[PDB]
Design a binder for this molecule. Structure first.
Ligand SMILES: *[C@@H]1O[C@H](CO)[C@@H](O[C@@H]2O[C@H](CO)[C@@H](O)[C@H](O)[C@H]2NC(C)=O)[C@H](O)[C@H]1NC(C)=O
Ligand SMILES: *[C@@H]1O[C@H](CO)[C@@H](O[C@@H]2O[C@H](CO)[C@@H](O)[C@H](O)[C@H]2NC(C)=O)[C@H](O)[C@H]1NC(C)=O
Ligand SMILES: *[C@@H]1O[C@H](CO)[C@@H](O)[C@H](O)[C@H]1NC(C)=O
Lengths: 106, 212, 105, 121, 121
């Protein structure tokens, strides 16, 4: 299916940023969040909708509840200016559906 | 086993006790002093046998993990309460005079995951946290297999939601003393069914996945 | 239910531990209380249920035993400890006390 | 907490004695009143308990038809009347409160006793 | 000491064929799923297709089903993407990424991504 991520998110430094990953019955399907810098490769920041990788600053966080998945990147600071895409593996179609994206600006 | 009664108002209990509680409903004696119980400290110092009535402390019967509660706030009635546990290795019995409690040893197996940092020496049958593969652990469970999760930060909606449509039905889910025990249904229609939960160790999210 | 205290006749020096065995006719579990009956005055409860000490009783006095045989342990004898001791059978409707144990100095 | 008992009184043989038991520092209701016979040279012997709340009385098998226990809620005093005094009915009588009746334990304990009413027959 | 290195930037005329390589130096191949994701200039990422490491996988996106043929030789432990019939919608920066192979695939993510191959059409 299609993920209805917002076209943009506007945030101030030292605040919480919420990127909602919207999809039908998205609670039953895992989301994987990837941080897209303008030139650097997608850095995985959340996988299996709440897990923090081994190497990452602690402020990154995220949860999936109901039909919306929120990447709560608390304490927004410099270096977080990126596009965060949620990826969902579609079991019925056996093909991963990739989110449109939502740039976070300080 | 095949019983749904656990109240003790000749109450005889024969059940697989998985952190299940025994309600010893006894009068204050300020209304009817003829009634008495022969063991004073019932469920704490209780007869091991039926004919040879000898007082033995509750530590020396065959229970493994336990806590005994006497709480007297209710003015109408007072109760002496004991919690039993799945960790027992044999079918012990004790009699409070008659209150017959049978702690049947659990015929199936036990699987314990201690994501918490603590020494639950009572049941050393495990996976630890090292078996977690990429911070996710996938523990299959045979029919009736008793899964235990020791993680204190269980968050909410543990075993409530199962990923990928159909949810793995659990007969009983117990959350006692920060300890989360999963009872396998012992009968499953299709093997391809999943139940999930969350845990927070070292602020990392460790999650367990249970399948038939 | 005659609860005979066989060690009834006693004579103990100050500073010496004692043991008073108290035995009843039938099994009466832990339903025992120990009283200190000074000459004149009034009896004073020492141990409740034979396993926990009554408030206002020094650490010298202690209770042991269950079911049929019960024990008194005194760490150090005192002139206040000098008195007659009785057993109370809380089990069964009549309450048969002991014959006494004069713990003579 | 203290329990005061009336002064000793010596009645003639064949008469009756009334002994007064006063409760101070604790609610008179909710605690059974137990009477004990301290015969000289003999052990304490239990006579009966009186329930303050209900008013019911139960007596020992020996004194099933001689002793009578009453009270007065206005004054909160416990009275015991014994009839048919004999040469073996001379003793020191104590009324004690059961601190254990109120909660938890089923045993009978006598935390506080009376002064001891000396009755001579 | 562990990294994923892709082919250098290449320019291909429209209608031709472009081959993109993804060799796994630090990590042994066939342990992880192999995925191909392309990012159009000034546009969101689009995952092209996935090949199962244990057995050959035909899972491709519906948009890229006709012209994508993903082969795994495993002799040099390199992942090869064969792309042909290029057009204005077939130019992007291509990224190869790995996720752990499991019986159920929804868990685990693309922890490590390739260096990036720029294709101009
Ligand atoms: C259960 O948890 C403990 C602690 O998280 C694990 O390791 C034990 O660690 C203590 C020291 O903290 C040692 O003294 C114990 O001997 C260790 N346990 C064992 C069994 O060796 C433990 O491995 C976990 N699993 C079990 C089965 O106890
Ligand atoms: C259970 O997990 C513990 C770690 O919590 C493992 O214990 C370590 O084992 C290695 C290898 O034996 C030792 O070098 C470490 O010193 C141990 N750590 C501690 C804190 O004792 C244990 O190996 C695991 N159980 C297994 C793998 O069976
Ligand atoms: C048990 O005891 C606790 C004491 O903390 C009291 O709060 C509670 O009301 C009691 N419950 C029952 C059922 O007696």
């Amino acid at each position: 299916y299609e993920l209805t991520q917002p076209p943009s998110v506007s945030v101030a430094p030292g605040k919480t940023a919420r990127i909602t990953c919207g999809g039908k019955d998205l609670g039953s399907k895992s989301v994987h969040w990837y941080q897209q810098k303008p030139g650097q490769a997608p850095v995985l920041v959340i996988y299996y909708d709440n897990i923090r990788p081994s190497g990452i600053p602690e402020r990154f966080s995220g949860s999936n509840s109901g039909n919306t998945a929120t990447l709560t990147i608390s304490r927004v600071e410099a270096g977080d200016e990126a596009d965060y895409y949620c990826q969902v593996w579609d079991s019925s179609s056996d093909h991963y559906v990739f989110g449109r994206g939502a740039k976070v600006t300080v | 086993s095949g019983f749904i009664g656990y109240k003790c108002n000749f109450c005889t209990i024969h059940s697989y006790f998985i952190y299940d509680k025994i309600r010893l409903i006894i009068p204050k004696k300020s209304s009817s002093p003829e009634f008495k119980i022969l063991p004073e400290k019932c469920f704490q110092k209780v007869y091991t046998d039926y004919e040879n009535r000898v007082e033995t402390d509750i530590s020396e019967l065959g229970l493994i993990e336990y806590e005994i509660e006497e709480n007297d706030t209710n003015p109408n009635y007072n109760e002496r309460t004991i919690t039993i546990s799945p960790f027992s290795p044999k079918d012990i019995e004790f009699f409070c005079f008659m209150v017959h409690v049978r702690v049947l040893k659990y015929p199936h197996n036990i699987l314990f995951t201690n994501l918490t940092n603590d020494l639950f020496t009572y049941l050393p049958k495990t996976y630890n946290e090292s078996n977690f593969v990429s911070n996710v652990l996938e523990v299959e469970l045979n029919d009736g297999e008793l899964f235990v999760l020791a993680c204190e930060l269980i968050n909410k909606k543990c075993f409530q939601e199962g990923k990928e449509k159909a949810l793995y039905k659990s007969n009983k889910i117990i959350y006692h003393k920060n300890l989360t025990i999963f009872k396998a249904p012992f009968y499953v229609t299709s093997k391809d069914v999943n139940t999930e939960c969350t845990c927070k160790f070292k602020n990392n999210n460790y999650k367990i996945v249970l399948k038939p | 239910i005659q609860m005979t205290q066989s060690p009834s006749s006693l004579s103990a020096s100050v500073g010496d531990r004692v043991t008073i065995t108290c035995r009843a006719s039938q099994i009466i579990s832990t339903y025992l209380n120990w009283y200190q009956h000074k000459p004149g005055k009034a009896p004073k409860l020492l141990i409740k249920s034979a396993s926990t000490l009554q408030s206002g009783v020094p650490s010298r006095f202690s209770g042991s035993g269950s079911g049929t045989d019960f024990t008194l342990t005194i760490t150090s004898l005192q002139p206040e400890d000098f008195a007659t001791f009785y057993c109370q059978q809380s089990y069964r409707d009549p309450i048969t006390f002991g014959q006494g144990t004069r713990l003579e100095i | 907490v203290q329990l005061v008992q009336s002064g000793p009184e010596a009645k003639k043989p064949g008469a009756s004695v009334k002994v007064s038991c006063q409760a101070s520092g604790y609610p008179f209701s909710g605690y059974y009143m137990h009477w004990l016979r301290q015969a000289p040279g003999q052990g304490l012997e239990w006579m009966g308990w009186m329930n303050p709340n209900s008013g019911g009385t139960k007596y020992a098998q020996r004194f099933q038809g001689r002793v009578t226990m009453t009270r007065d809620t206005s004054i909160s005093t416990a009275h015991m009347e014994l009839r048919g005094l004999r040469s073996d009915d001379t003793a020191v009588y104590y009324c004690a409160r059961d601190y254990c009746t109120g909660s938890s334990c089923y045993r009978t304990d006598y935390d506080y006793w009376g002064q001891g009413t000396l009755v001579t027959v």
